[PDB]
Amino acid sequence: FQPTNVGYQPYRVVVLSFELLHAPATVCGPKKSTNLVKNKCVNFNFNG
């Protein structure tokens, strides 16, 4: 690595690996929760 090098320039990398296990969830997107409703038909999203 020298700044004059493009395929020979330094690149920083971050790889995000996501676990979609059957377990309780742990890291969420910013989507805001709302109150539960029962016996009425609903569109739903639990943990994604």
Binding site: L21, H22, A23, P24
Partner: peptide, 24 residues
């Protein structure tokens, strides 16, 4: 020394509820 395990030492393979079923 040794002993027969019989049919002990089964465990839940994943955190999913399943009931009244023969699941592979």
């Amino acid at each position: 020394a040794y002993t027969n395990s019989f049919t002990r030492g089964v465990y839940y393979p994943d955190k999913v509820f399943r009931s009244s079923v023969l699941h592979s």
